[PDB]
Amino acid sequence: QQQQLPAAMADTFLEHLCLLDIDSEPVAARSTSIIATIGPASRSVERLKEMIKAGMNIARLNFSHGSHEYHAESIANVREAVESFAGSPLSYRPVAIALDTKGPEIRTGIVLVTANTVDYPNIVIYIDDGLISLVVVTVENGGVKGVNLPLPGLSEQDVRDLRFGVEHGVDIVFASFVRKASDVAAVRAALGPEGHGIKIISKIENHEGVKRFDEILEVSDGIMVARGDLGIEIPAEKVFLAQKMMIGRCNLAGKPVVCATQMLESMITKPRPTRAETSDVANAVLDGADCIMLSGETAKGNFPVEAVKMQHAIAREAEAAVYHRQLFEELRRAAPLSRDPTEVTAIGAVEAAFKCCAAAIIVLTTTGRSAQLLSWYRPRAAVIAVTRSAQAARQVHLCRGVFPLLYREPPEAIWADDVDRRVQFGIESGKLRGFLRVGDLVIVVTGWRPGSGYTNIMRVLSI
Amino acid sequence: QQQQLPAAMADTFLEHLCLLDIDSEPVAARSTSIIATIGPASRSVERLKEMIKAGMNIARLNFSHGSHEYHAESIANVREAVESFAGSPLSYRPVAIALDTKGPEIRTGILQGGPESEVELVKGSQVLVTVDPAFRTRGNANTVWVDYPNIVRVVPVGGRIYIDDGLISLVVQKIGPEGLVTQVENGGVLGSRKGVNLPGAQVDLPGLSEQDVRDLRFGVEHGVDIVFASFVRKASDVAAVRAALGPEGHGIKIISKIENHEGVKRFDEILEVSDGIMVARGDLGIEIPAEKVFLAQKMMIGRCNLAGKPVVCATQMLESMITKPRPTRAETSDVANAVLDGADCIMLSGETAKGNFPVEAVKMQHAIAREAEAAVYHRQLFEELRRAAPLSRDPTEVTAIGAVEAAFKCCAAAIIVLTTTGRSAQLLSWYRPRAAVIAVTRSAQAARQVHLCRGVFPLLYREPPEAIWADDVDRRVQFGIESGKLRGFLRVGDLVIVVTGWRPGSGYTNIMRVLSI
Amino acid sequence: QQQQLPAAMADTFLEHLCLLDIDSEPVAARSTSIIATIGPASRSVERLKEMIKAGMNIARLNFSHGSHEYHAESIANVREAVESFAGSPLSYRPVAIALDTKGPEIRTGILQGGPESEVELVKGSQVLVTVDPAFRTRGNANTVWVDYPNIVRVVPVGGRIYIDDGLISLVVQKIGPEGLVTQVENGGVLGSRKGVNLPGADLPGLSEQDVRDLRFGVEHGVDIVFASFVRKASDVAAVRAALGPEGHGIKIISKIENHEGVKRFDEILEVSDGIMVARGDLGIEIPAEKVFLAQKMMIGRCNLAGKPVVCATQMLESMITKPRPTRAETSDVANAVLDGADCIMLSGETAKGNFPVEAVKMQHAIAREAEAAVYHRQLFEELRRAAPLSRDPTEVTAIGAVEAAFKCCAAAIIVLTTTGRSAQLLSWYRPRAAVIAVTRSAQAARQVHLCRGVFPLLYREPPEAIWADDVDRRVQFGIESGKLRGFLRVGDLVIVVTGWRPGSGYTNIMRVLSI
Amino acid sequence: QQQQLPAAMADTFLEHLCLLDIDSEPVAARSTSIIATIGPASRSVERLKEMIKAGMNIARLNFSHGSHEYHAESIANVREAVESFAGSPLSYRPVAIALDTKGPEIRTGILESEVELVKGSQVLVTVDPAFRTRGNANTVWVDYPNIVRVVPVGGRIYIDDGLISLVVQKIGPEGLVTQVENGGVLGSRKGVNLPGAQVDLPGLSEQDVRDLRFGVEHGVDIVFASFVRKASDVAAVRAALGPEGHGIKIISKIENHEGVKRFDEILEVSDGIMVARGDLGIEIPAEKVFLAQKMMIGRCNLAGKPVVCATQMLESMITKPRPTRAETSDVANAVLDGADCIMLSGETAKGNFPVEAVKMQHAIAREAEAAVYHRQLFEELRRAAPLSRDPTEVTAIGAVEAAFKCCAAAIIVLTTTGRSAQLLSWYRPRAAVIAVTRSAQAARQVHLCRGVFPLLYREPPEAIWADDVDRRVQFGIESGKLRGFLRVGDLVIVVTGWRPGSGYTNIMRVLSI
Ligand SMILES: O=P(O)(O)OC[C@H]1O[C@](O)(COP(=O)(O)O)[C@@H](O)[C@@H]1O
Ligand SMILES: O=P(O)(O)OC[C@H]1O[C@](O)(COP(=O)(O)O)[C@@H](O)[C@@H]1O
């Protein structure tokens, strides 16, 4: 069998692992999203072209580096690479643009903290990547940038940066050093009226944030486990607890979670990843992460495309080995009851999908909310979302296993007939890229009248 | 809270019990069906009228007694009692009519000048069983006759021979030239024509006698809805019934009676060809040790649950009520477990055919079953299905499971299903929602056969079809809603699930929608 | 396979059922205890002898009837029938003797020259209920006499009055300065000295008599007190008070017979030794549709707390008159057992019916099967989970002994016990292997019948010089006994639980032996 | 609370995660074992001393390199560092010695220079005696003659950690004309993999035989066998191992498809299994290892045999004083997966941070283990485990259950071979399993099992077996106190037998301290 089905039917977790099969080829669209950071190594349009084709979904601007002019070009490039496949509505792959806020970093001069002597005033102690170590009139590690010490979250610059972001129609803000819920209100304030549209993904990068995680989760659209700083700010042995914990809470709350930093580092320099790294990816996926990310790997290294091609392979397998069985069960039980017709339909659509090994669930969505309520349960069938809002169609990448499709055609006269052309559009698209073959069954989720908020029907159709 | 919700939310089975509340008033239509047997105590229309109001759902004809003329009258009466409430399509309660085949019985002679007379059998007494046309009548206390000749060549020295209801007991302590000479291991008053069983003995009687055939033919002729088949012992036996039923009655459901070892042994082949099963505790508790029935019942109700087919739990659930206006603790308790075991319906015999308290008997089944059902631990139960249930590719199954799950999510009050044959209602109850499954159908027959299914509530839709299929479907749906409101399954504000199809005709259900009332 | 093993391995409850086998002969001591009430039908010694051999474990004195002198004789007869098998220490089956407190009953009078003669109460007719002692002996179709004086300043007009097992029925329409004037709502054939129930309508739990009765109990060495109409934990403190210093030994089994009791059931569980679900009065005091929930609930909480629970009244009624039980009745037993019941009981069936021995032989059969169909799997699991942690070497061993038993399909767990405590902590988990308890205290060896699947063996031999060697003769004694009565055959494994030094409270060792 | 207890009591896996606490200090012996490979970076006695103190448990000789004389010295050093703490029988930490068989490698020739191979550029692969050292940017020589007859036209050929890639483009008379599909700096005598070729090279060469003979002669405790591909292969090793060493545990390395394919037959005949991510990760797609790992650890768990997770768990430390996030997290999952021990290679043999590499595997494993969800876990075994009639199985399960009931601090077992200790850890108590034995060897082999802490008992036997058994028990408790596994008031479980000798465990007792 394929997609680890035998292992998907085991009665306990153990037997399940006992049943994983290295010759059980996956056969599914990979559903974890890929965020690639744009940098010299990947700024050109041609390179972008390739990285999409490889599976990129979200491009990341790192405002820790580079002028505004510099990033203006980056967006401009992404967008161009992207529209180069406007070629064929059935294959067009939207790409998000996320701006990674620079935040209150602490760099150093171009041992007495002030080779022997070293821009955060009230400092009055680790330099670079945490390889260098000094202790308070102080040096405990050696070595030939960041400065982390186990400031305002929103500087004048940060503000300036978000304004830029709004002005340029970025889709997502990854917010650096969120340490308390007031901090995301800040971002959202700076973002201004013109941009309630933009998802806020709070970065967790230190103890306090870890500590106040719950308040933070409640006000954000999602979370980023920033193992980079976090893994210096706290003992390096503990991160795996913060990640696992955070992915889990996030999973419960129905919000997209991102696992970050050093998942494929060696590739910065080399054409294959270590065994550690490969295995780092599978587990982030198995853990529950919504999307997994690349930095050095894509921004400066000799193998940007290859980096992306891997996350894509690893994630495919990983996702074929998820123990939905225990997993879906666990949710229903944990999920509180609900009276909102959309929740209700989605849980239905999902149960339905399991009963028949549905190939996909197809949902007309305006904002994507309903797409999202389908993946809260983590179907295994693909969630194909047909929408006209190129933006929703993009933001929908923050959600496991939802595959946006942007629908261009001008509305029919008759609502009924339009809905149907949008559905069938999904199916067509579906066939074309190979999510469904004739004979398959498919679930289709829709509404009883035009506009967001009214999803409430589920239907079973054979292809 | 009501309907045992807090016990419905317990993390384990044990906690769940620990949480049952005797001041947690149920609040749901009872969903185990009640079969009442019609007899003198309940053959009048007025009485019939009462017993429906009390919750009867299926009337049972016991072709082990009485002429065809006699049973004609019974149908004729049910039907009349039943249309006495045609008075409001929203309250009209269809009722099944089930013919309980008489099968290969072994009753005894009519006593000495006594169709009323009772001899009295004494412990430690020689008794002659005979097969002589002579003693056909000539019953005494030292002699009995049996309508099953071959019994001499089939009971060996030492074997036990049971008379009337297992209550009277005898052991063959001498085979020879005419009688079998037995010692009365069991005492008590014997009648005319009572029942005989010979455990550990292999009975050879055809499942389907000429009569049995005759009876089915009558049944088809009069439009009964269900055949309960006595003594089914192997799947060829139901092919028999269905054969005799003839072309004019593929419509009729066949409910194989399990009444002995062999049948229990070949239970699987049996289950596969029938529409359901009846656990016939009566004979089955004489045919095997009486300590072992409870296993046959619990096993059979389980397998049946799995297969998706309606199962019935039978005989002596309320016996003391044949004589008495209240049940023993045993009896009350016996019902709750039938329902907690999984039983699709639970039945009444003496209790409704003979006894001084027919209506009351039915009122009780109804109360008991309400509580038992409120006390069902769906939680573990639904789970266990999904898991046991194999995968399926049939759009209907798929919808039903969906509808169901959807109903849990919102505490849906009802699932409304348009159905032509009932199939689709059935697939909804296979999972045992807890919301009521209201089935709107134009086939008065299906609408009746649907009573064999836990928590389905037929509504017969009369109106002639609209021009536009769409509009028709919608008047049928709303019909259900109206009905629903009227009898109190749903109040404004409630949510409801509606299950329908994409084109006219059976076999195409495939849509599920959520509507507020 | 036997003992429903294939159904014992099923992955869910459902498949478990799906796999019960009527041709899967049990092969296990039955572990639910049988309580038989003693009465004329079962008072003789020879009958007694028979009923033991059939499986009786506990004889029940019903102090609702019969003088002290009468019950004295009964005990004296049990004990004799019992010691008639002292003849082989390896077979001897101890029997308990339990006294069933009469409590705050309400019964009618004897009939107008009618100790076994009946009036016939007719539906819709006037019945004069009376409190006048002059009429005590004057029962007719128009007058029932009741031994509860206050019934007149307690039962309101409109009120209902059930008579004889809730079968007769009477509605109070006028309070009189000398009695009640009711219209018969339900009629039937009314006899003498019959139980009266005034539901929804000051009788002390412990009357002077009750006290008198316990004193008798203690005086004669009864083992258990089944306490009628316990409605609140202060009621058992009362019984225990009356039982007095000479009897802390005696187990107290609080009887649940009404709403309040059901309502306060927790406080009552906590102070008693066990509980009896008295379906009789319970089934009249509350709606009859609800008992099955007070039974299921009570059995469960009891199961959780580690306390024996008893399932009572009308399990085999038709046998009072008939040589076979109804299909209801049979299936009532199996569920009591499948529910969790520690012991299941007979009353009419054994005290006044024509089939006492048979009654007992059925409860025995039914319960053997029923115990072969318990779903331990989910069961043992649920316990460990529910059970709190514990730091008491005995719990800790027992849980161990038990898990160990499961691993190997142990045939039995053999336990040395002085008081039986340790036997009990083995059965809290409901092993499936039999818990054989070797003890020198004929009393513990008896009280240990309150516990599911513990089979006492009374060890007579005078102690060896060497503790070690004594322990070992007591173990091996168990094994011998076990072989003899068929709990274990060569090749079986066995678990053996014991202590590191003499006296109660020190169990702490578990060992695996092959036979 | 500590040791992730609140997360320990969650009703489902998810809640369990939701409940992990980064301020919930662990408080338990780490129970995953640490194998560290001895190399220049860690061959001195002083360094060895340090590495033990940091947690090392098993030392690995890699017979892929270095003469016998060379490994003789390594043993001779381990042993010395080790007995440097014979100084207090309560602290002494035994250390295994494991011989990592070299096996059927294909390695290249000699040029510290590195000819650089370039993408596109044609490479000639040879087996020609004469070009043994002539090899160049355009010529690589391999020590496996047959490479030419067995790599079909268009088969791939990797060189060095799969970093160089070559597709056979033609096969002329004197060898493989490939095309450098992946380029790189190439070194000397470097490892070469031919996936989807059917290599005919014998598991057990003459050398391999020679090597085990050395192993036996010198008393190594464990053989990690390279490139086990079928059960007949371990019989070989066991044969070579010879009569004088039935003692030695054989741990079959899994390093390729076939092995992964026959994994069952292989599991049944070995003492354990090594998931060799190195070769395995080049022999199959690299995206698939995590399923070989997860699968093999799980089956292994079921079977009751110790499993090792191998290769590149901390790589960057070869060069750096801290691990990458990837690497850290690689360790925790090995542990959460079920791994019996986790291993170090470059990190301990060649790198600039041997002691540190060991310190980290220690810290990560501590937490990983505190965060184990026994709850679901123990359950899952009992259910999976088939029934058993062996009194030792039965006691262990029992001792274990017992340990959960009272938050036993430790399970103390007298063991002769260690088997019974092993059956205690099959269930993964959470109390430590302290094993008192007189066989310094078992006491070392025992480190292949999660959470078993050998204690070597020296004293000569009492007259009275009873009394002996008791001094051995109490010995544990003493030790136990001394190193802090147990404090007064603690409860403890003790497992023993009814008579002297292996095979007869059968008693379980509860004692308060
Ligand atoms: O943005 P959401 O919340 O997913 O809403 C999905 C909406 O899409 C629809 O299916 C179609 O809406 P439009 O016709 O406005 O495009 C609605 O029925 C439903 O309300
Ligand atoms: O009898 P079944 O198999 O339940 O089929 C139910 C049928 O009822 C419908 O909802 C309506 O059918 P009709 O219009 O023929 O009455 C169909 O869509 C569906 O096929």
Q: What is the DSSP string of A135-181?
A: ------B-----EE----SS-HHHHHHHHHHHHHT-SEEEETT--SH
The whole-angstrom separation of Cα C443 and Cα B194 is 51
The reply to whether residue A210 touches residue D14, judged by beta carbons under 8 angstroms, is no
Pairing state of beta strands D156-159 and D139-141?
unpaired
Q: Give the best residue of A134, A212, A240 to mutate against chain D (max D CB count within 10 A).
A: A240
Closest CA to B281 of B226, B340, B331, B208: B331
Closest CA to A333 of B12, B143, D353: B12
Please name the residue that has the structure tokens 């578990």: C510
Q: Which amino acid makes up residue D361? A: Q
Stretch(es) of chain D classified as CATH 2.40.33.10: 104-202
End-to-end CA distance of chain D: give it in Å, rounded.
Answer: 23
Please name the residue that has the structure tokens 């072989």: C483
Q: How was this structure determined?
A: X-ray
Q: Is the dihedral of CA C217, C222, C225, C226 positive or negative?
A: negative
Please name the residue that has the structure tokens 């109903």: B407
Helix, strand and coil in chain B, % to nearest 5: 40, 20, 40
Cα separation values, A405 from A27, A423, A424, B406, Å: 20, 11, 12, 27
The token duo for C117 is 């003669």
Q: Which amino acid makes up residue D71? A: H
Cβ neighbours for D165, distance < 8 A, ≥ 6 positions apart = D156, D157, D158, D159, D180, D181, D182
Q: D225: part of which helix (H) or strand (E)? A: strand D222-225
Residue C327: list chain B partners with CB under 8 A.
281-282, 285, 290, 293, 315-317, 334
End-to-end CA distance of chain C: give it in Å, rounded.
Answer: 21
Stretch(es) of chain C classified as CATH 2.40.33.10: 104-204
Q: What is the CATH architecture of B1-29+373-517?
A: 3-Layer(aba) Sandwich (3.40)
Stretch(es) of chain C classified as CATH 3.40.1380.20: 1-29+371-515
What would the CATH number be for the domain defined by C30-103+205-370?
3.20.20.60
Phi, psi of B314 (to 5 degrees): -135, 160
CATH 3.40.1350.10 fits A30-103+153-318, yes or no: no
Closest CA to C159 of C128, C183, C141, C187: C183
CA of B78 to the centre of ligand 2 (A): 29
Task: Determine whether the shortest distance from the Cβ of A387 to ligand 1 is under 6 A.
Answer: no
The string over C499-515, giving b where at least 16 C-beta atoms fall within 10 Å of a residue's C-beta and e elsewhere, is beeeeeeebbbbbbbee
The whole-angstrom separation of Cα B356 and Cα B325 is 8
The whole-angstrom separation of Cα C232 and Cα C238 is 10
What would the CATH number be for the domain defined by B104-206?
2.40.33.10
B94, B446 in Cβ contact below 8 A? no
Closest CA to D239 of D231, C210, B397, A449: D231
Closest CA to A279 of D319, D324, D377, D17: D324
The number of C-alpha atoms within 13 Å of B340 and in the hemisphere containing its C-beta is 22
Which position among B107, B233, B309, B370 bears the catalytic label? B107
Determine if residue C502 is labeled as part of a ligand binding site. Answer: yes
Residue B515: list chain A partners with CB under 8 A.
456
Q: Which atom of ligand 1 is nearest to the CA of A450?
A: 14
D206-218 helix and D231-241 helix, angle to the nearest 10 degrees:
50
Helix, strand and coil in chain D, % to nearest 5: 40, 20, 40
D68-83 helix and D45-53 helix, angle to the nearest 10 degrees:
50
Q: B190: part of which helix (H) or strand (E)? A: strand B188-190
Task: Determine whether the shortest distance from the Cβ of B421 to ligand 2 is under 6 A.
Answer: yes
Q: Measured between CA atoms, how close is C380 to chain D, in angstroms?
A: 11
Residue B18: list chain C partners with CB under 8 A.
297, 300-301, 304
The whole-angstrom separation of Cα C418 and Cα C459 is 11
Cβ neighbours for C351, distance < 8 A, ≥ 6 positions apart = C37, C38, C39, C40, C41, C42, C62
Q: Measured between CA atoms, how close is D24 to chain A, in angstroms?
A: 10
The whole-angstrom separation of Cα C317 and Cα C322 is 9
The number of C-alpha atoms within 13 Å of D407 and in the hemisphere containing its C-beta is 11
Closest CA to C358 of C368, C349, C367, C370: C349
Phi, psi of D281 (to 5 degrees): -85, 10
Phi, psi of D364 (to 5 degrees): -50, -55
The whole-angstrom separation of Cα B174 and Cα B59 is 44
Count of beta carbons in the 10 Å neighbourhood of residue C5: 14
The reply to whether residue B402 touches residue A348, judged by beta carbons under 8 angstroms, is yes
Facing residues of A174 across strands? Answer: A100, A201
Pairing state of beta strands C168-176 and C160-163?
antiparallel
The whole-angstrom separation of Cα C44 and Cα C29 is 27
CA of A57 to the centre of ligand 1 (A): 24
The whole-angstrom separation of Cα B206 and Cα A356 is 44
Residue owning the nearest CA to atom 15 of ligand 1: A451
B234, B263 in Cβ contact below 8 A? yes
Please name the residue that has the structure tokens 């999602």: A222
* β strands within B342-426, DSSP E: 345-348, 414-418
Please name the residue that has the structure tokens 């990674």: A100
The whole-angstrom separation of Cα B24 and Cα D376 is 34
C428, C398 in Cβ contact below 8 A? yes
Residue A20: list chain D partners with CB under 8 A.
291, 294-295, 298
Cα separation values, D374 from D410, D451, D465, Å: 16, 13, 36
Cβ neighbours for D431, distance < 8 A, ≥ 6 positions apart = D403, D407, D408, D409, D410, D411, D492, D493
The whole-angstrom separation of Cα B317 and Cα C471 is 52
The whole-angstrom separation of Cα D188 and Cα C135 is 121
The whole-angstrom separation of Cα C325 and Cα B285 is 10
In whole angstroms, what separates CA D249 from the centre of its chain? 12
Cα separation values, B389 from B274, B437, B486, D285, Å: 19, 20, 36, 36
Candidates 3.40.50.2300, 3.40.1380.20, 2.40.50.140, 3.40.50.10800; correct CATH number of C1-29+371-515?
A: 3.40.1380.20
The whole-angstrom separation of Cα B396 and Cα B415 is 14
The whole-angstrom separation of Cα B424 and Cα B439 is 9
Pairing state of beta strands B126-130 and B180-183?
antiparallel
Pairing state of beta strands D96-100 and A222-226?
unpaired
Stretch(es) of chain D classified as CATH 3.40.1380.20: 1-29+369-513
Q: Which amino acid makes up residue A164? A: F
B338, B278 in Cβ contact below 8 A? no
The whole-angstrom separation of Cα C296 and Cα B507 is 43
The whole-angstrom separation of Cα A19 and Cα A6 is 7
The whole-angstrom separation of Cα C242 and Cα B390 is 63
Phi, psi of C496 (to 5 degrees): -135, 130
CA of B93 to the centre of ligand 2 (A): 21
Please name the residue that has the structure tokens 């070497």: C393
**B257 annotated active-site:** yes
In the complex, which subunits touch A with 3 or more CB pairs below 8 angstroms?
B, D
Cα separation values, B71 from B37, B55, B75, B293, Å: 12, 22, 6, 31
- Per DSSP, the three-state class of B344 is coil
The whole-angstrom separation of Cα C140 and Cα D167 is 114
Determine if residue A367 is labeled as part of a ligand binding site. Answer: yes
Q: Count the residues in chain B.
A: 517
Rg, C-alpha atoms of chain D: 24
Residue C287: list chain B partners with CB under 8 A.
367
Binding-site sequence positions of D for K(+):
62, 64, 100-101
Resolution in Å, one decimal place: 2.9
The whole-angstrom separation of Cα B514 and Cα C14 is 31
Q: Is the dihedral of CA C132, C137, C140, C146 positive or negative?
A: positive
**B53 annotated active-site:** no
The whole-angstrom separation of Cα B455 and Cα B407 is 14
Closest CA to D451 of D414, D483, D479, D426: D426
Task: Determine whether the shortest distance from the Cβ of A133 to ligand 1 is under 6 A.
Answer: no
* β strands within C66-114, DSSP E: 96-100
Cα separation values, B23 from B76, B394, C293, D477, Å: 43, 43, 10, 56
Q: B188: part of which helix (H) or strand (E)? A: strand B188-190
B454, B432 in Cβ contact below 8 A? yes
Cβ neighbours for D210, distance < 8 A, ≥ 6 positions apart = none
Q: Count the residues in chain C.
A: 515
Please give the residue of chain A at the shortest CA–CA distance from D182.
A271
CA of A404 to the centre of ligand 1 (A): 14
The reply to whether residue D389 touches residue C400, judged by beta carbons under 8 angstroms, is no
The reply to whether residue D402 touches residue C407, judged by beta carbons under 8 angstroms, is no
Q: Measured between CA atoms, how close is D184 to chain A, in angstroms?
A: 9
The whole-angstrom separation of Cα A164 and Cα D11 is 47
The whole-angstrom separation of Cα D476 and Cα D473 is 5
**Class of the D104-202 domain?**
mainly beta
Rg, C-alpha atoms of chain C: 24
What would the CATH number be for the domain defined by C104-204?
2.40.33.10
CATH 3.30.565.10 fits D30-103+203-368, yes or no: no
The whole-angstrom separation of Cα B475 and Cα B99 is 35
Task: Determine whether the shortest distance from the Cβ of B443 to ligand 2 is under 6 A.
Answer: no
Q: Measured between CA atoms, how close is B305 to chain C, in angstroms?
A: 9
Phi, psi of B403 (to 5 degrees): -50, -50
The reply to whether residue A355 touches residue B401, judged by beta carbons under 8 angstroms, is yes
CA of A365 to the centre of ligand 1 (A): 5
Residue owning the nearest CA to atom 5 of ligand 2: B506
Residue owning the nearest CA to atom 6 of ligand 2: B419
Stretch(es) of chain B classified as CATH 3.40.1380.20: 1-29+373-517
Closest CA to A56 of A80, A82, A74: A82
Phi-psi region of A418 (alpha: psi -120 to 50; beta: other; left: phi over 0): alpha
Residue owning the nearest CA to atom 8 of ligand 2: B419
The whole-angstrom separation of Cα B147 and Cα A300 is 99
The whole-angstrom separation of Cα A456 and Cα A433 is 28
The reply to whether residue D330 touches residue A276, judged by beta carbons under 8 angstroms, is yes
A18, A276 in Cβ contact below 8 A? no
Pairing state of beta strands B253-258 and B276-279?
parallel
The whole-angstrom separation of Cα C39 and Cα C158 is 38
In the sheet where D156-159 sits, what is the strand order? D139-141, D122-126, D176-182, D164-171, D156-159, D192-193
The whole-angstrom separation of Cα C38 and Cα C348 is 9
Phi, psi of D477 (to 5 degrees): -65, -45
Residue owning the nearest CA to atom 14 of ligand 1: A450
**Class of the B30-103+207-372 domain?**
alpha beta
**A261 annotated active-site:** yes
- Per DSSP, the three-state class of A395 is helix
Pairing state of beta strands A402-406 and D452-456?
unpaired
The whole-angstrom separation of Cα B508 and Cα C183 is 61
In whole angstroms, what separates CA B336 from the centre of its chain? 15
Closest CA to B13 of B407, B370, B384, B386: B384
The token duo for A78 is 């992404």
Closest CA to D253 of D285, D296, D205: D296
Residue A241: list chain D partners with CB under 8 A.
20-22, 367, 371
Task: Determine whether the shortest distance from the Cβ of A458 to ligand 1 is under 6 A.
Answer: no
The whole-angstrom separation of Cα D342 and Cα D334 is 7
The token duo for A395 is 């933001």
Pick from B15, B306, B332: CB nearest C14:
B306
Q: Measured between CA atoms, how close is D417 to chain C, in angstroms?
A: 20
Determine if residue A37 is labeled as part of a ligand binding site. Answer: no
**D47 annotated active-site:** no
The token duo for C333 is 């037993």
CATH 3.30.420.10 fits D1-29+369-513, yes or no: no
Phi-psi region of C389 (alpha: psi -120 to 50; beta: other; left: phi over 0): beta
Q: Which atom of ligand 2 is nearest to the CA of B501?
A: 18
**Class of the A1-29+319-455 domain?**
alpha beta
D269, D249 in Cβ contact below 8 A? no
CB pairs under 8 A between C and D: 83
In whole angstroms, what separates CA D395 from the centre of its chain? 27
The whole-angstrom separation of Cα C241 and Cα C227 is 13
Q: Which atom of ligand 1 is nearest to the CA of A415?
A: 14
D204, exposed or middle or buried, with CB in 10 Å at 0-12, 13-18, 19+?
buried
- Per DSSP, the three-state class of B509 is strand
CA of A360 to the centre of ligand 1 (A): 19
Residue B415: list chain A partners with CB under 8 A.
none
* β strands within C131-218, DSSP E: 143-145, 160-163, 168-176, 179-186, 196-197
The whole-angstrom separation of Cα C270 and Cα B444 is 57
Rg, C-alpha atoms of chain A: 23
